[PDB]
Design an enzyme around this catalytic site. Structure first.
Site, PDB file in Angstrom:
ATOM      1  N   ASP G  41      68.256  94.970   1.330  1.00 51.26           N
ATOM      2  CA  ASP G  41      68.453  93.677   2.083  1.00 51.26           C
ATOM      3  C   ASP G  41      68.287  92.495   1.494  1.00 51.26           C
ATOM      4  OD1 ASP G  41      65.310  93.834   4.381  1.00 51.26           O
ATOM      5  OD2 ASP G  41      65.976  93.997   2.229  1.00 51.26           O
ATOM      6  N   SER G  42      68.032  91.234   2.183  1.00 49.32           N
ATOM      7  CA  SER G  42      67.524  90.074   1.551  1.00 49.32           C
ATOM      8  C   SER G  42      66.233  90.031   0.965  1.00 49.32           C
ATOM      9  CB  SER G  42      68.250  89.070   2.343  1.00 49.32           C
ATOM     10  OG  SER G  42      67.711  89.273   3.653  1.00 49.32           O
TER      11      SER G  42
END
Ligand SMILES: CCCCCCCCCCCCCCCCCC(=O)OC[C@H](COP(=O)([O-])OCC(O)COP(=O)([O-])OC[C@@H](COC(=O)CCCCCCCCCCCCCCCCC)OC(=O)CCCCCCCCCCCCCCCCC)OC(=O)CCCCCCCCCCCCCCCCC
Ligand SMILES: CCCCCCCCCCCCCCCCCC(=O)OC[C@H](COP(=O)(O)OCCN)OC(=O)CCCCCCCCCCCCCCCCC
Ligand SMILES: CCCCCCCCCCCCCCCCCC(=O)OC[C@H](COP(=O)(O)OCCN)OC(=O)CCCCCCCCCCCCCCCCC
Ligand SMILES: CCCCCCCCCCCCO[C@@H]1O[C@H](CO)[C@@H](O[C@H]2O[C@H](CO)[C@@H](O)[C@H](O)[C@H]2O)[C@H](O)[C@H]1O
Ligand SMILES: CCCCCCCCCCCCO[C@@H]1O[C@H](CO)[C@@H](O[C@H]2O[C@H](CO)[C@@H](O)[C@H](O)[C@H]2O)[C@H](O)[C@H]1O
Ligand SMILES: CCCCCCCCCCCCO[C@@H]1O[C@H](CO)[C@@H](O[C@H]2O[C@H](CO)[C@@H](O)[C@H](O)[C@H]2O)[C@H](O)[C@H]1O
Ligand SMILES: CCCCCCCCCCCCO[C@@H]1O[C@H](CO)[C@@H](O[C@H]2O[C@H](CO)[C@@H](O)[C@H](O)[C@H]2O)[C@H](O)[C@H]1O
Ligand SMILES: CCCCCCCCCCCCO[C@@H]1O[C@H](CO)[C@@H](O[C@H]2O[C@H](CO)[C@@H](O)[C@H](O)[C@H]2O)[C@H](O)[C@H]1O
Lengths: 104, 155, 172, 171, 606, 127, 86
Positions: G41-42
């Protein structure tokens, strides 16, 4: 969040050009094409040209110009201690008077 | 540039406020002249009073050292806000608190120095004694006057 | 603000990690507290109410300001770092080579032959670059500072010269 | 030597004789001998050569003597021809007096260096002579201004003489 | 006299020859840096001969060779005072500069302008030697501002960097404020003693020397970066590391203290000046040492150490011990220049990294740099019988046995403890623990230029203090009787600083997060003095310059009250005169009025 | 957490400014057209900065307006009123009258002392 | 310093990712998209960029960093900033 395809493509094309530009900055074997143009002796000519010739000039300058004028070089007079013998006159400076020679 | 593009008088009407904002490459909403107090600002835009040190370092400025873009209106005080001069960036410590602690430290140290001058430190020792009437002749005393005799005794 | 809520949280994460690293110093101590800090961010990863998410971000910024390092670590060549702009005095624009005396240019005959080819490539591409920008820009000028790639073979990406030919990061 | 010993006095020199109390060799003694051989000797010969050339061409220059003319006291007022000579004389004596104070200041500075840590007592004569000459110079020339002249100097003297008369009148 | 006078001038003439060769295109710029370094080494040798003559017999002299200018009764000659202070500082300054220059050949090898760099370093030195041998105040001023300008040029070496130009101009600004006091002292001495010569000043021995000495103190406050005019010295770290080593050991920062030493015949009789310098020194030494406790830039830590050591020298002046203050100048030069060259060695090996938080684990990786750093740190903290001990220890026990301000004495003692704390910070965070630097290891201290230059200053930091102390003649009465607790004060508080520093350092390794205290931020941000003063004072001055001086006055009111008003009246009068109807009837009607008033009012007919 | 007190020389960080958050479609509209003006000015500059045949200075009207606004445009927009007259009087006459009495008073004292003989001028012969 | 090379930069970029416990070292290639392929994810991406800054010793601005989503992009960004052309 990454690059868009247009963004990626522009970066790809700049990168080829930039790397080609940087490659062309490298110098060829012949460049630059110049136009036409052991310690002891090396250290000896330094002492000669930077210590002896200057001190020759300075000593000549001080001895025959600066010191021929009044009060140009003023020395603190030597310290005289009891028991010294003056060279100018040979006068003998009396010794100091006897101490109580106490020690500890 | 031509006369129509140079700074002018204080804008009186919304039509003149729209012409000034367009002239300065600003939005009419963002355009604000200095107050018309007769000090000579004319219609030159009033921009936020912030250092150039406060602008984004990573953006591709046309003038990276100045952090300005070609054509953007320059602050009236631009030359005072270059990165070599006045900085306005936020501080980790509040300005008023910063002043209190600096002044408080300095005032206290000055007060304590006055106290230390009132109560000096010294050793339990009597005055140093010198021979020959306290070196009267050596210190430049007149040799034609007999000095007030000074006598030091043993102990 | 032109940053989305996502970009603000992600930025706050990196900034808080760096300041945490400045307090901790020792790598093992940093790893321990970087994971506790990650756990806090993961604890509200799925918060759906934007209003509650924004309030969480507001408090986190207030907490970061209170706890930031007064003297954080800066990479030497980063803005504010001790080597920032250290080599700007050695970066000389390429156009200065046009003023070189011929006796100076004769010292690098191969370099200036290539340089001429690059200058030739700049002239012969300029018109297409201007035309491409004209025909891809909506009326009333562009709305963004983004630029297009080249769309054809032999076309160069418009406005490339000062990107490609900029001074090296360590010129001298 | 070259200057007059009376104008620029120097007490007799008393250098103590070497009295080494160490078996070690003195580095200064051998450095001095090397200096005489490698510096003083060749420098001296070069000078003796130059002096041989100056003796073949001997010629003289003189110190200008200025005859005394009447002072500004003897000049009828607004008589420029006599005022000019008195004014030029006064300016010549002003420059000479400046150099006199410089001689006395140079004696004072030489004594302070020569006497070392005993200067405060051994330079009392030079301090006194400097104090007296500076007082006289101040009376003659101080406060005249950039546009000083013999006329202004006379007015300053007359003002001083008038006060001296009055102070005596008190006695 | 002939050898002493002759040799003491070749030293100064020798140093100008590289400058003359460079400026007169008669050099082989192949290895100009080596040429300049060689000339400095030879100057050091020739400077030892006059010093040995002074050591032997105390022989001193003044050389007034060239008569430059006579202003009425003020003769100005080019003069050189070859005395105690000149004959000992010069060989020390040259010896330290010999190492810095050899070190800079390695450290600035990659610089495209290394030749110019070595020329500027040589000018920096020449202006300092002019300063230190100056016999009159005008010659002193030449060197006083010469080092100030060379400092500007070298601090701003990397002129593309805005921070280097701000720091360079900051040094000029703070030193120019100090120079007001220098000019004040010159004017007072000329007016009241009719001299700029040091001999006449001392012979006349003014009794009311408050004003000249306050001016001298103000000049020393700026040059030596005492509290009030202090921020510029840490900022001078913008320069290349060789500049910092030379600017902090010899040359600039020591000129302020040296100026007060030169005038000790005056200050030794003026108690009120002694109190001011004592308190000025005590606040400086305490305040700057406090700042160094929390710095992470290695150059700034060492920079704040110099500020704290200069403050200690001012205290020594403040307790009427000029010769001890001079001794500290000489001993300080050795280990402080070495410390800066050690930090440069670390910075170079870690790709220009300067934060101690990104060092670590260098004790074994850089063995020779480690040894020099430890020797330099121990000498700085007054370790017995290292070079630092022979000045600092005598200063502390001369200060607690004096009739002195109690706050100044107590503040000075705390600063000695703080000296051991920030010293421990550098060793703990740079050398010990695990490496915290990037993964591509490039450590390498194996260049002979680096090793030899540091090795000579390492030998100096061990024995130079012992040699100097045993060769200088006594000029005071050393106070050797005191209670045990005053004798060992410096030693004890130093040890307590090391112990407290070690506990504080080791607690950084615990897994506990603690919110910063108010005192931590005060120390880290330098008491907020630069944060406030360097924004407030420039803002007020620069805003006044534009708003009032330039806009209100020059572009408005000076225009309004003269040219604009005068010309407006003339225009109005012109329109009244010329706006007429061209009507015969009106002009002749005005003739009748003129004739009537000419008779009725003015009697022009009588 | 004590709140941030902004000053003139210590501005407010954006991360603590409420205006930064709670964005409206009206604010996002203003940012869009701000970015448009910057993008339009950038294109005009780049079209000249990248021109191969251009040799010279890219004249910047914003710079010209700035130097003109801070010189030639000031008097035309000046009005003598209570603010300008009081400021002009304070900063123009004020300091001159102040320094006059400082120097006049100091010099009157000195002259009085010199007349009576109470000013030490023992070695003062340079002026 | 010892000059960088495109292969030199690529090796170290992959080296760092192989020491990240959330990436399988066998499924990883220079073309692996961090989200689509590697499944990160980010928040993870921020740590990866943070780790490349520490690795190569220079900062990547947040606006630039958020767009680097595969190891090849990081290699290309670094070579561009360091003038690496091989
Ligand atoms: C009788 C008839 C005689 C005629 C007059 C004779 C003198 C003129 C000689 C002409 C020929 C000189 C020559 O060939 O130039 C070569 C010389 C070396 O060539 P270069 O290395 O290629 O220089 C190019 C750079 O621009 C060089 O730039 P740079 O920065 O590397 O050095 C240039 C230097 C400018 O020149 C200097 O100042 C050198 C240092 C002083 C000597 O600038 C400075 O160093 C600024 C600081 C100066 C020191 C100030 C500090 C205070 C000292 C005060 C003490 C005074 C005691 C007396 O070039 C110059 O420096 C040009 C300067 C010419 C003006 C001389 C000013 C002297 C002062
Ligand atoms: C109070 C009691 C404590 C003791 C006070 C004694 C006096 C000490 C204070 C001296 C004056 C303070 C201003 C100093 C300004 C300065 O040092 O320049 C540095 C300044 C920014 O430098 P910096 O803070 O390092 O920023 C780094 C990059 N962000 O950059 C600048 O702005 C300087 C360049 C712009 C020129 C501004 C000039 C301002 C003039 C005011 C200073 C004084 C002028 C002379 C009058 C004083 C003497 C009476
Ligand atoms: C406070 C002072 C501030 C000074 C500011 C200005 C600084 C400028 C830099 C100064 C340069 C060094 C000056 C000293 C070197 C000698 C200068 C000189 O021209 O000497 C000539 C000398 C002057 O004689 P003097 O009576 O002392 O004074 C005359 C008044 N002008 O006449 C002589 O004595 C004759 C000397 C002849 C020497 C012959 C040896 C030549 C050997 C070959 C050399 C090549
Ligand atoms: C070893 C060191 C030797 C030298 C020691 C010198 C000590 C000097 C101490 C000076 C302290 C002055 O700083 C003083 O701190 C307190 C605490 O913030 C400030 O007080 C401030 O803090 C809090 C709020 O945050 C409140 O108490 C108050 O409303 C506020 O004014 C004072 O306004 C300030 O005057
Ligand atoms: C008033 C002045 C009185 C003294 C005048 C004496 C003038 C004599 C000048 C001799 C040459 C001076 O100028 C210069 O000297 C040095 C040392 O020799 C030479 O330099 C040479 O030696 C040095 C170190 O040994 C090397 O760093 C350098 O690579 C090499 O070229 C230069 O090649 C020469 O151009
Ligand atoms: C004039 C110069 C004087 C120089 C004085 C030099 C320092 C003098 C000794 C200072 C104190 C010595 O250190 C004392 O013993 C050991 C170290 O051996 C320390 O022990 C420490 O070891 C480890 C380090 O691996 C720490 O993580 C741990 O927290 C602590 O237990 C003690 O916490 C300390 O009390
Ligand atoms: C202080 C002692 C001596 C002072 C003597 C001063 C006398 C006046 C000398 C200048 C005469 C100039 O005369 C005239 O002045 C005005 C401004 O002043 C100028 O006019 C300019 O400024 C005025 C008003 O500021 C504007 O209305 C006008 O648009 C502009 O052109 C004229 O171009 C010039 O012709
Ligand atoms: C101490 C004695 C000083 C003597 C100085 C010599 C005086 C010379 C007088 C010149 C008179 C003519 O100067 C005249 O000034 C006015 C200033 O309003 C100028 O007029 C200018 O400003 C006015 C209003 O500000 C405008 O209406 C006009 O359009 C503009 O041109 C005239 O263009 C100029 O012709």
């Amino acid at each position: 969040s990454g690059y868009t395809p247009e963004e990626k493509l522009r970066l790809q094309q700049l990168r080829e050009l930039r790397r080609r530009w940087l490659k062309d900055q490298e110098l060829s074997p012949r460049e630059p094409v110049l136009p036409p143009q052991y310690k002891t002796y090396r250290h000896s000519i330094f002492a000669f040209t930077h210590v002896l010739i200057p001190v020759w000039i300075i000593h000549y300058y001080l001895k025959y110009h600066v010191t021929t004028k009044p009060y140009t070089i003023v020395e603190k007079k030597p310290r005289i201690f009891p028991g010294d013998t003056i060279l100018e006159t040979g006068e003998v400076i009396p010794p100091m008077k006897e101490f109580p020679d106490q020690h500890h | 540039i031509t006369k129509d593009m140079l700074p002018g008088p204080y804008p009186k009407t919304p039509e003149e406020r729209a012409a000034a904002a367009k002239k300065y490459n600003m939005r009419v909403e963002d355009y604000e002249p200095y107050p018309d107090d007769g000090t000579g600002y004319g219609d030159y835009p009033k921009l936020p009073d912030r250092s150039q040190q406060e602008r984004d370092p990573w953006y591709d400025w046309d003038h990276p050292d100045l952090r300005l873009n070609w054509g953007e209106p320059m602050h009236w005080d631009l030359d005072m806000y270059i990165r070599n001069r006045v900085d306005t960036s936020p501080t980790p410590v509040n300005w008023n608190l910063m002043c209190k602690h600096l002044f408080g430290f300095v005032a206290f140290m000055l007060f304590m120095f006055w106290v230390g001058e009132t109560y000096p430190a010294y050793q339990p020792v009597g005055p140093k004694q010198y021979p020959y009437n306290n070196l009267y002749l050596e210190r430049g005393g007149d040799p034609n006057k007999e000095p007030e005799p000074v006598v030091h005794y043993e102990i | 603000a032109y940053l989305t809520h996502q970009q603000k949280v992600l930025r706050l994460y990196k900034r808080a990690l760096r300041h945490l690293e400045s307090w901790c110093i020792h790598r093992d101590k940093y790893r321990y507290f970087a994971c506790l800090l990650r756990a806090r961010f993961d604890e509200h990863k799925n918060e759906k109410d934007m209003v509650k998410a924004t309030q969480l971000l507001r408090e986190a910024e207030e907490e970061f300001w209170h706890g930031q390092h007064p003297q954080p670590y800066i990479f030497p060549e980063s803005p504010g770092g001790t080597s920032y702009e250290r080599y700007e005095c050695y970066k000389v624009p390429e156009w200065c080579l046009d003023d070189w005396h011929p006796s100076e240019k004769a010292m690098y005959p191969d370099y200036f032959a290539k340089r001429e080819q690059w200058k030739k490539l700049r002239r012969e591409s300029w018109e297409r670059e201007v035309k491409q920008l004209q025909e891809e820009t909506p009326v009333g000028g562009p709305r963004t500072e983004a630029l297009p790639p080249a769309r054809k073979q032999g076309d160069l990406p418009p406005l490339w010269w000062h990107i490609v030919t900029r001074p090296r990061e360590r010129p001298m | 030597d070259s200057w007059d010993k009376d104008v620029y006095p120097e007490p007799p020199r008393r250098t103590p004789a070497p009295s080494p109390q160490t078996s070690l060799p003195n580095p200064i003694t051998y450095l001095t001998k090397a200096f005489d051989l490698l510096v003083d000797r060749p420098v001296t010969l070069v000078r003796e050569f130059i002096e041989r050339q100056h003796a073949k061409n001997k010629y003289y220059y003189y110190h200008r003597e200025f005859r005394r003319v009447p002072d500004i006291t003897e000049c009828q007022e607004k008589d420029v021809l006599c005022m000019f000579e008195a004014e030029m004389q006064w300016r010549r004596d002003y420059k000479v007096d400046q150099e006199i104070v410089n001689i006395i200041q140079e004696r004072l500075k030489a004594c302070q260096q020569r006497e070392g840590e005993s200067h405060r007592q051994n330079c009392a004569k030079e301090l006194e002579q400097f104090t007296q000459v500076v007082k006289a110079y101040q009376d003659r020339y101080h406060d005249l201004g950039a546009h000083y002249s013999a006329r202004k100097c006379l007015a300053k003297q007359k003002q001083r003489m008038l006060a001296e008369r009055k102070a005596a009148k008190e006695a | 006299m002939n050898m002493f006078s002759s040799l003491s001038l070749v030293t100064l003439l020798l140093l100008t020859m590289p400058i003359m060769m460079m400026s007169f295109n008669t050099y082989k710029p192949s290895n100009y840096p080596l040429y300049v370094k060689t000339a400095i080494s030879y100057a050091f040798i020739t400077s030892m001969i006059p010093t040995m003559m002074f050591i032997h017999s105390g022989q001193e002299l003044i050389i007034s060779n060239w008569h430059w200018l006579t202003i009425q009764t003020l003769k100005l000659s080019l003069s050189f005072k070859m005395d105690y202070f000149s004959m000992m500082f010069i060989p020390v300054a040259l010896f330290v500069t010999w190492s810095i220059m050899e070190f800079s050949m390695w450290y600035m090898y990659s610089d495209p302008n290394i030749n110019k760099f070595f020329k500027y370093l040589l000018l920096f030195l020449i202006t300092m030697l002019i300063l230190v041998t100056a016999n009159n105040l005008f010659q002193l001023f030449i060197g006083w501002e010469g080092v100030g300008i060379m400092s500007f040029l070298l601090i701003g070496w990397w002129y593309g960097r805005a921070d280097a130009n701000t720091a360079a101009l900051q040094a000029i600004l703070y030193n120019r404020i100090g120079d007001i006091g220098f000019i004040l002292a010159m004017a007072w001495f000329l007016t009241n003693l009719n001299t700029w010569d040091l001999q006449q000043i001392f012979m006349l021995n003014p009794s009311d020397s408050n004003m000249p000495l306050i001016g001298l103190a103000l000049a020393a406050t700026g040059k030596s970066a005492q509290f009030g005019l202090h921020p510029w010295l840490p900022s001078a770290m913008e320069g290349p590391t060789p500049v910092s080593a030379l600017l902090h050991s010899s040359t600039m920062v020591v000129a302020g203290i040296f100026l007060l030493i030169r005038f000790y015949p005056l200050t030794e009789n003026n108690k009120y000046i002694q109190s001011i310098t004592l308190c000025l020194g005590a606040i400086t030494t305490l305040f700057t040492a406090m700042c160094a406790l929390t710095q992470n830039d290695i150059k700034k830590i060492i920079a704040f150490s110099t500020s704290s050591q200069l403050g200690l020298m001012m205290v020594t002046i403040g307790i009427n011990q000029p010769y001890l203050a001079f001794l500290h100048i000489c001993t300080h030069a050795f280990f402080k220049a070495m410390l800066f060259m050690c930090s440069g060695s670390i910075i170079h090996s870690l790709n220009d990294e300067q934060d101690i938080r990104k060092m670590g684990g260098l004790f074994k990786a850089m063995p020779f740099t480690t040894t020099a750093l430890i020797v330099g740190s121990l000498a700085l903290t007054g370790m017995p019988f290292l070079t630092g001990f022979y000045s600092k220890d005598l200063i502390i026990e001369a200060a607690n046995t004096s009739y002195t301000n109690a706050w100044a004495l107590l503040m000075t003692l705390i600063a000695t403890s703080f000296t051991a704390i920030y010293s421990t910070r550098i060793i703990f965070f740079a050398l010990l623990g695990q490496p915290r630097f990037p993964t591509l290891v490039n450590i390498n201290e194996n260049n002979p230029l680096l090793i030899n230059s540091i090795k000579r200053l390492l030998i100096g930091s061990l024995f130079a203090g012992y040699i100097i102390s045993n060769n200088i003649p006594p000029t005071t009465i050393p106070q050797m009787t005191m209670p045990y607790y005053l004798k060992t004060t410096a030693l004890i508080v130093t040890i307590l600083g090391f112990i407290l520093a070690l506990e504080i350092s080791n607690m950084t390794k615990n897994l506990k997060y603690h919110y910063p205290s108010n005192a931590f931020k005060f120390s880290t941000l330098l008491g907020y003095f630069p944060t406030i003063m360097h924004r407030l004072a420039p803002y007020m001055n620069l805003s006044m310059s534009q708003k009032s001086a330039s806009s209100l006055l020059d572009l408005i009111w000076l225009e309004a009250i003269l040219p604009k008003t005068i010309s407006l009246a003339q225009m109005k009068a012109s329109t009244l005169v010329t706006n007429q109807k061209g009507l015969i009837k009106l002009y002749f009607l005005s003739f009748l009025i003129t004739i009537l008033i000419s008779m009725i009012l003015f009697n022009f007919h009588e | 957490f004590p709140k941030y007190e902004a000053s003139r020389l210590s501005s407010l960080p954006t991360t603590l400014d409420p205006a930064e958050y709670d964005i409206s479609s009206e604010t996002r509209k203003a940012q869009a057209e701000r970015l448009a003006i910057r993008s339009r000015l950038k294109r005009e500059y780049q079209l000249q900065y990248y021109d191969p045949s251009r040799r010279g200075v890219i004249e910047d009207p914003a710079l010209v307006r700035w130097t003109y606004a801070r010189s030639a445009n000031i008097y035309p927009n000046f009005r003598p009123n209570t603010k300008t007259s009081l400021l002009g009087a304070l900063f123009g006459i004020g300091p001159l009258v102040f320094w006059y009495y400082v120097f006049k008073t100091d010099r009157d004292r000195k002259e009085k002392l010199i007349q009576e003989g109470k000013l030490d001028r023992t070695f003062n012969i340079s002026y | 310093a010892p000059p960088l090379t495109l292969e030199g930069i690529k090796d170290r970029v992959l080296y760092v990712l192989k020491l990240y416990d959330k990436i399988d070292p066998e499924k990883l290639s220079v073309n692996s998209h961090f989200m689509k392929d590697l499944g990160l994810d980010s928040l993870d991406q921020v740590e990866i960029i943070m780790a490349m800054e520490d690795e190569f010793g220079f900062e990547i601005p947040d606006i630039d960093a958020e767009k680097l989503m595969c190891p090849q992009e990081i290699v290309d960004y670094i070579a561009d900033k360091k003038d690496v052309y091989e």
